[PDB]
Structures are given as structure tokens and as C-alpha cells.
Symmetry: C3
Subunit: 426 residues, 3 copies
């Protein structure tokens, strides 16, 4: 018996909703929201495709290595329900963020905004320490963030745990955020490392092309009875020396240990503190920003000595085509450049100088590549960003690093690299 | 030569379709569907953020451990095409469901619904055994499902294989489901473990606030010539003793082996059977439900003896604010509570009692923590669910466990824990 | 103090946009696009659910093994911004494509189309070599692609690297593509393997049911100072002998090494070249296509000898219900069958013959299963595709393989298998 049915006529062409009026938008992804602000959804993401070549100190033998990888490949889902409840889930397909055991999350958070301007944020999200870190990874001026953060990257990374943060703008001239987090490392009882963060910024001028910003950061974590990796291992602006998400320098990459050890035993260190300062000034297309931080990792057991590190960076940026870097008091952070000329886009030049010093008195004998005393590095990052349009940014940068009391296997105390990136935001 | 073009005028503001009329909705995610029911799409998900602390038997040394993790972080894509063909793909970003080798699937299925009320379901999906299991993981009353399922978790998990299931409501008073599945373990010829499931429920009253439900479950698998993990390792309501998706109790978590072994050799066991009973009654905001199951893992080689286990739970729940738990005859399962009061939400209290017994006559000598004979555990789970709104549920629960013939390293025969969860459904 | 608010009235029912007019569509997924072609977004995917059984040479002992797995489970996000900038991100939830270190990408690309008909494509995407490979994995006629590609699968796989490709149709009768890529393997300096691809097709007739197609392919890679896996390990049409995404034949799967070694040392080989030919002819529901390729892997160090391999396939296909296979000059590739009869769908029968030969003079002694000389295999793939509708395709195929100078442990020189697939495209 063959199948059959009466012919149906279908009404065609309209798009409607059964609830509150909806506005839908696309700039390459999708946004849908009710006009009464009760409900919304946004699907987006970011692709950062990098190719780099580098030599000298950046590699073990000093010869040129390369890397061809996605720095980030986020899929981003966020939304609002019942006006005051937001979520944001950003997962990194490149596997550079998060982990196999715990999920490749850049963020998985829920925010209650009912106390606006005060927000309450929960879940897995990087703690707020530092201006360059607060700035979206889409819009950080240099291809990689500064080396001073590499002295204590726990201060502003989620480390596969959970946290709770309160934040607010204040008096139309300031921003404060404070939070507690549990990080993914246990003491001998299976109790996680607990961490406190504070950030406070005074930014009396806080708009694109008109920024005056000074801030303070503090981070503390309790390492009592906890085995942990104390290594400071800066990449000094060259991600490709060691990275997920594609090809890297492999066995010839030199992500060097400037201090600390991979397995510091339970009981070796008691706690770990970092203070930071931020400054920024912007007038139209010109901006200057800088940060300084200092870490003290405090020994517990007498066989161990404190480890200290200090670092800073300063950056100048200028949009040759005249546009301002966006700036938001909510988060006290820079953001994108929006090109005014549709035919040629926006062109931005930048220079960042980084300087770090590691004081690890536990290093008591020379190795083949590392001398007793304070290890140091300086880096220079000079480059161009072409904002083709709001979605696409193409970048090229030259990076140079110079070190003290540490070399590669070739004896190099400096190295050079070039990195190019194609970024697509949707 | 500079680029240029004539100015174009674009029509603005309208949203239309070229096919059948579409209705679009958002409650934080996205639904799009043609009004003639031919085509639909839904993007959603669920975040379950847990923080817990626990001690005694829950940890190896008895001291307090913690856990801070996502129990589930699903992204959910489902849709319909040509009316009768549905798909559902739920992937767990927390990596608590599925595996690295095979995909982190909660579900990846295709359902043909053309024989409605009869459905034919194919792909990777948990077999249907048990009421608490059939209930969505969004809406299970207690933070973790009962310990009786932990006696034989193969009965209602997909185990990275594939299956085919037929199901239907019957006579407006019953629900039946039966299926076959291939599970991810091979015999010496590389042929997968095959499993049969049946579930039948009589529910003459089957609506929110008016439920009378009795059901039977059966599961069978053939383990001929197959090496397998026969361990029964209950978490007794405390997920954080050992979990993916974030921080757990690490080396101090005590997910204890009550019976069975990690590598039971090919030829040791022939087959494995489980029978189960379900009962539920609901009148308005009050509900009572309970399940009992019994397992016989039947030895093949004479060196091995049968392993038996029996378990049950009973749960009372009451919505203090008066709302009913939703109930669906399709799937014969409870579902959500929908809050009536928008300002305070819905408040639900629950108590679940669990009781398990493992009879493994292959354990023929004491270990340091486990005595010859039948191992037993009882657990009590007492808690509160706050349904803030349809999307957000916040929970807190106290859990206590007491064991017989098994302790931790500290000699504890009981333990306590507290778990809190923030759930966001979109 | 209880919460309260004035009652708000909300406008209901409309769906609008603030920019250019939008058209939205769903066939199970989602498409949204502005009518002026400036912006678009598409969320889709593909599920390929496979069950297979196989014996003889396909397994080590010759007995029947099975497999129950997803061949592919892609989530697909693609879009357009500012008219000329496209992206496509396809991630494989089954974990059969890409890797844990680098991301499970089938594709993560950005394409600039402003030079239309010339495209510039960047990112992680399979290089273009071969007609059956260019054809979407949704619409390849046989359940697995041919064995000749298995002789040199680097020629048309991204291998977790990055690349740049230029392509264009020409003169309304041809298609050309050429590209460079960095592949995920380093020389001793950490510099990636670089690869060149060219493909050129003359297709004076290039529409569904009217195809005349001849093409040439070339691929080259530089292996100087690079350790690499030179093994040729064909599955001969039976994916389930060894696969991710679910259960496979495990320890009894025989994915046999026909030549090459797992760790060919740095300096062993200098470069690697493959030439290929393509031919296709289609008249209405009948099509014939074939490809031939030859590889020379050229030794560097004198201890090593060149490895050569040659392979081809030929396929006949006929749509019993009369429909043509779609064909696109852009990409010079076949595509789907679109069923005309809504009640019974489209039915297609196919036969593919594969023939491969591996000449590895480095194999200088017999092993227990492999004789000195040229190893060979032939395979026959006979099957049916039922295109239920545009979204759903169900397939069944018989596969037989016969080998020369290589057997399994049972001494089998042939084997048989059957594979069934349910595919859902959205
Ligand atoms: C039940 C009544 C609980 C009252 C809820 C008040 O605090 C809720 C907001 O915080 C959510 C609790 O977080 C629990 C999950 O763990 C933290 C995730 O980072
Ligand atoms: C070709 C003609 C086949 C007729 C199809 C009738 O059964 C189709 C429904 O079941 C789909 C088959 O499943 C194959 C994939 O493996 C099972 C996935 O769990
Ligand atoms: C800054 C000015 C650069 C000019 C850009 C011209 O070429 C851009 C198109 O190609 C993108 C460059 O790709 C860089 C990322 O690495 C390759 C990814 O596969």
C-alpha cells in the first residue's frame, strides 16, 4: 500500500513570536532579545590564527623554529533570563584554555545583575587583576599579554576552579571588584587552594579618547600543606615556543624556568601574595598604559627560602587613522578600535616594553644554562594592527627578548621573533 | 588607486522567511520552528555549578575535603526535519559525561516519530531503567541520583556505544520502553557487549499534583569472554569525592570499592541481570517515590563466584510554596517545578533515604579497610531547592552516610557532607 | 519588606531588526542573513551513526568483530561579515577529526571572497587533492573514502596545522586550487613540515546529470631532518577495525601496516611527492568516476630506500529513482541527491572497486604476517543509499577485501564486512 495524504496549504513568509516583541541581529553570529529586556541570547566567538618564527633564546639550540596554531578558537554562548540573571559560556576549541579533565573553559559563569550597578558573579572565570588582563583577549593591543603577569599567572586565571566576585562602578569615577576563588590544587586533606582578589581603579576620565586611569591590584592565596608547581616560565611574547591549538616549536622550544620548581612539596610554602599598580592615559588616537607588580611566595618549611619576583610593562599605542581605543568604566578596561574608513579600515601601531626579575635564593648552584642570582628578562614588542572592519583584525609584530643569568643551550642571551595573526570575531 | 562605490540604500527593519511561517522564542537560548510543525531547532543547555565539603567515610583520612566543579555543563542542539525526524545532541563541556576517546556525549540521538505514539530512537543515549533516572538531570530533586543505581550503573548509561529503542504510551494509562544497545567493551573477538532493557509503567494518574505510578525494570547484558570492571564504587551522594569538571577531593577522596574488581578477566563472568521496581504518588505539592533493584552478576569460570547486590531509596518531597512537580506519561517521569510567585520563587524541601548491600563472596580475606562478608551503606539526603524562576535553581543539601564492613583509612564508618548548587537552564 | 513593582504592559508578537532586513530559515538548524548579503550566520551539523560487523583479514584472528560509533558528529558554525569575509568552524564531537592537543577541527577557516571568482582561504582546512575527497563527507557515495588516499593521507588532510589557499573557477569550464600548508611535525629546529598542493580540473559539462570532468592533482612535502610516521595502514572500507567516536574492534582489529614504520628517524627521508588523476562522467541518474595516484617517498640517508605506492578506484552509481547527483564547478565536486518523491525518498545503488600496491624495499625480511615484496590489496564496496529526505540518509554496504603478501594472524588473505549508517544533516 502506497502512502498518500490530502494536500496542505501552508501560510508562508512571516516571522513572529508568542511572547514579548523580539529584535534579532547578525554581524556574523546571532543575537536575539526581547525588547522589554527580560530575555536575550547571543551566539558568537573568536578565531585567532597565528603563524610565527623565532630564534635565539626562544629556542633551545638558537636556530629558527616556527608555530602555526590557533591562539584561541572560542565558541561563546551567553544570555539573560528574567532580566537579572545572565550566563556566559565560552569554550576554547583550540584547547589553549582550561583542560581535558575539567573542561576547556575560558568562562562558564552566572551573573546576578539585580543590584545594578553592583554585580554578583559566580562560576569559572578569571579573577580581576590588571588592566591588560581585564581588556578582552580580542582587543589586547599586543599579540600576547605582558611578561609581568607570567611571574604569577595564578592571580588572574581561574585554574579550573570556582569563584564568587562582587563588582561595581562607583561615583561615576571608579571601579571596584573583589572575589574569592577555589583553585584546582588540593592540600593533603583534599581541600582546594583558596584565593582572594581585589582590584580598585580611579578613572575620573573614562571614555574612548579621554582616559585617565590609576589602579591597584591585590591577590593572595593560601598554599598550606599543598604540593604545587612554583615555576616561573615566561614565553616573553612568543606563544609559539610552547602552545596547544596547532603546531609549535616542539622539542626545540625554550620556555625556560627562571625560578621555582615543578613539584614543590606539601609544606614547602605557606602563602603567596602579589600587589599590582595600573596606569593609563588616552587622548584621541594616542594612549599610554603601564603596570607594575611584585610577588612574594613565602616559605614554610625551613629548607625553603622565599621566592620574589617583580615585573612591569609600558605600552604606547597610536591609531594612525585617528580612531580612539574604546574604554569602559564597567570593568575599567580598554576595548576595541572601530574603523571609521570602510575602504581601508583602521591602522594602529604599538610598542610595548616588558621587564621582569626573578629572585629565587633556592637556586644555589649553576646549571648548564642558569647562573645563581637574580634572573632577568626584557622584551620589546613592536607591531601593527589592521582593523579591516569590526569583525576582522590582522596583525604583525616583531618581538625581541634579552636575558640575564639564563641562556639557551647555545648560550644565547637574546632572541627575536615575528608573529602574524588573523582574527575573526563573530 | 583608492577604492570607491556608488551608495546603496538598504531596506531596514523587517524579519521574514522564504518558507512556511516561523515562530521564534527566547528564554535565554533559542527556539525557531515552522508553524506547520515540519521543521524546528532549539539551542539550549544547562549549567550545574557545585561546591561541597565532606569528611569521615567520604575521605580517606576522614578529614574535610572539598570540591568545586561543574557537575554538568551541557550545550544542547535539537531539531525536527520533515515533521517526523528528530535529533538531539547534548555535549558536556565539563567532561563528566562520555569520554575523551568517544566524545563527551550526554546524548546523540535520532528519533523517528512517524508512528506516534510509538517512537523509534537510535544512537547514543542512556537506556531507560528507573524513575529517578528517567527524570531530567535538570530536575532530579536531590543533587545526585540514588545509590541503588550505583550498584549497576550500566543499566541506564550509554557507555559510549549505540542503541535502538522503541517506546510508547499505552491506553492513556501506561508507558513502555524496550531497547538493545552495544556497549563499549569487547570480547576477545572484538565484539561489543550487548545489552537488553525493558521498562513498563502503569500510571493511571499521570499529571502534575496527581500521580499514581508503579513500574518494573529489567536489564540484561552478555559478558561472555569479556574483560571488564566489576567494581561497585558508590559516591553515596557526594559527587565531589571523585569527579571531573573542576576540583575534587583528589588523593583524599574515598570512592570505595564495596565489591568487584577493576580487571575481571575474559571468561570470569557470563552475564549480568538487574530487576527493578518503581513507585510514586503525588498529591499537589506532596510527592513520595521509591525504587528497589537487585543485581546478579553470574560467574562463568569456576574460580569465580556470583556477585549480588540489592538497593533501594525512598524520597519525600514537598513544595512549601504549593506548586506541583510536573509529571509526563511520555517517559513516565517527574520534571520541573514552575514557580508561581515571581518575587520569591518556589521553595521545595526533600528527604531521600538510600540503602545498599553488596554480596561478593569472591572477597575471601580482610583488607585493611574491608571485612569479609556483605558490605552495606545507608545514606540520608536532606535539602532545599529554591526555584528562583524557570531558569535558575539554587540548592543546598546535607548528606550523611553510614557503612558496614568497610571503613576509610581512619576507621570511620560514617561521614557527612554538604553540597550547594547553582543551576542555570537555557 | 516584600518586593513589589508597578505592572508593566509589554508589546507582544513582533520580530524585527535594527539593521538591514533579515531572512531567517530552518531545516532543522538555523540560518539568518541580511538581504543585502552583508551579514549571515548558519548553525548546522552532521551526525553519522555507524554499526558494522567484519571478519577475515579485517580482524587479527579472523573471527567477527563489530563497531558501534559515530563516524562524524560535527557542529558547524559559519558566517559572513562585511560581505567579503567568511568563516567556517566545524568541530567533531566524535573526536575522529583533529586531536586532543590541537582541537577536534574538521575545519576552522577564514575566506576572503572579495576577488570573486577568486577566493583566498586561510586557517585549518584539508588541502584540495582528489574528487572523492573534495566531495562533502555528507555526500560521499560509499560509507568510507577510497583506499588509494590511504596510501598518502597527508595530501588532503590538515594534520593540525595552518594553510593558505587560492582557488577559482575559470572560463566557465575549469577549476583550479593551489595552496601551502604547515603540518604538525617539526624538524630538529622545531620548524614545521611545509607542504604544497595543486589541483586543476577541466569540466566543460558541470551540472547535475551532465558532468564531464578530468583533473590532475599534485602534492609535495619537505621532510628534511624530520622524524615521522611513514606507515601505510589502510582500513580498506571498514572504519570499525580502528576508530574513535565509540566502540570498535579493539585488540582484534587488523589495521595492518602494508609498508613504512611508525618512527622513521630525522634524516631518513628528504621529501615526498604524489601525483593524481581524476575522471568523472554523469548522465542523469548514472555516474562513473575514478582516480589514480602514485607516491614516491624519497630516501635521504643511505641506510634507507625509497617507498613507492600506487592506487586507484573506480565507482559506478545509479539513482534507481531517477535523480541526479548534484555537481558544483566551484570545488569541482559531486554533492547530494535531492529526493523528488516525498513518500519513498531516493534510492541509489553503487559499486566501488579499489586497488592499491605498496613497494617498500626497506622490508627485507618476512614477519609472521608480511612477506618481502610488494604488498597489495583490492576491495569491492557494494551498497545502497536511501535518501529519506534532504536531511536523513540511511545506508547499507557490503565490503570485501583481498590482499597479497600480507595476512592476519589467522593467515586470512581476504575478509568481509557489512556497514550500516544513519546520517542526519541539519
Ligand atoms: C537554597 C537557598 C540558598 C540561597 C542562595 C543564596 O546564594 C545564592 C547565590 O550563590 C549561588 C551559590 O553557589 C553555589 C554553587 O557553587 C558556587 C559556584 O561557583
Ligand atoms: C538502506 C535501507 C535501510 C532501511 C532502513 C531501515 O532501518 C533504518 C532505521 O535504523 C537506522 C539504522 O541504523 C544504522 C546505524 O547504526 C545504528 C545507530 O545506533
Ligand atoms: C598588518 C598588515 C598585514 C597585511 C595582511 C595581508 O595578508 C592578510 C591575509 O592573510 C592573513 C595572515 O595570516 C596570518 C595568520 O596565520 C595564517 C593562518 O593560517
Amino acid at each position: 500500500r502506497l502512502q498518500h495524504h490530502h494536500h496542505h496549504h501552508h501560510l508562508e513568509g512571516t516571522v513572529t513570536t508568542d511572547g514579548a516583541d523580539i529584535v534579532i541581529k547578525t554581524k556574523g553570529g546571532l543575537e536575539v532579545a526581547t525588547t522589554d529586556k527580560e530575555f536575550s541570547f547571543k551566539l558568537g566567538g573568536r578565531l585567532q590564527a597565528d603563524y610565527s618564527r623565532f630564534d635565539g633564546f626562544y629556542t633551545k639550540n638558537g636556530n629558527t623554529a616556527d608555530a602555526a596554531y590557533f591562539r584561541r578558537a572560542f565558541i561563546e554562548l551567553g544570555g539573560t533570563a528574567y532580566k537579572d540573571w545572565k550566563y556566559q559560556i565560552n569554550f576554547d576549541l583550540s584547547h589553549n584554555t582550561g583542560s581535558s579533565d575539567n573542561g576547556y573553559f575560558d568562562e562558564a559563569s552566572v551573573t546576578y545583575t539585580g543590584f545594578n550597578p553592583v554585580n554578583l558573579k559566580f562560576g569559572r572565570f578569571d579573577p580581576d587583576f590588571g588592566l591588560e588582563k581585564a581588556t578582552s583577549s580580542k582587543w589586547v593591543t599586543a599579540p600576547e599579554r605582558n611578561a609581568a603577569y607570567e611571574l604569577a599567572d595564578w592571580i588572574n586565571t581561574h585554574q579550573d576552579g570556582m569563584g564568587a566576585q562582587v563588582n561595581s562602578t562607583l561615583a561615576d569615577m571608579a571601579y571596584l571588584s573583589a572575589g574569592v576563588s577555589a583553585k584546582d590544587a588540593d592540600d593533603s586533606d583534599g581541600d582546594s587552594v583558596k584565593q582572594f582578589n581585589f582590584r580598585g581603579v580611579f578613572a575620573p576620565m573614562h571614555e574612548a579618547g579621554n582616559v585617565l586611569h590609576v589602579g591597584v591590584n591585590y591577590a593572595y592565596r593560601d598554599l598550606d600543606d599543598t604540593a604545587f608547581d612554583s615555576r616561573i616560565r615566561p614565553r616573553l611574547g612568543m606563544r609559539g615556543i610552547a602552545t596547544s591549538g596547532g603546531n609549535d616549536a616542539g622539542d626545540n622550544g625554550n620556555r625556560a624556568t627562571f625560578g621555582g620548581v615543578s613539584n614543590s612539596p606539601a609544606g614547602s610554602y605557606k602563602d603567596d601574595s602579589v600587589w599590582g599598580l595600573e596606569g593609563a592615559w588616552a587622548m584621541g588616537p594616542f594612549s599610554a598604559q603601564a603596570e607594575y607588580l611584585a610577588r612574594k611566595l613565602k616559605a614554610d618549611d625551613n629548607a625553603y627560602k622565599d621566592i620574589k619576583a617583580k615585573g612591569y610593562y609600558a605600552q604606547l599605542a597610536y591609531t594612525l587613522t585617528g580612531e580612539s581605543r574604546q574604554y569602559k568604566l564597567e570593568g575599567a578596561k580598554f576595548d576595541s578600535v572601530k574603523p571609521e574608513n570602510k575602504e581601508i579600515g583602521a591602522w594602529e601601531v604599538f610598542y610595548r616594553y616588558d621587564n621582569i626579575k626573578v629572585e629565587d635564593d633556592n637556586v644555589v648552584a649553576d646549571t648548564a644554562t642558569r647562573e645563581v642570582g637574580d634572573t632577568k628578562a626584557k622584551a620589546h614588542n613592536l607591531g601593527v594592527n589592521w582593523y579591516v572592519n569590526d569583525a576582522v583584525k590582522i596583525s604583525a609584530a616583531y618581538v625581541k627578548a634579552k636575558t640575564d643569568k639564563i641562556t639557551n643551550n647555545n648560550g644565547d642571551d637574546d632572541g627575536d621573533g615575528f608573529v602574524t595573526r588573523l582574527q575573526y570575531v563573530f
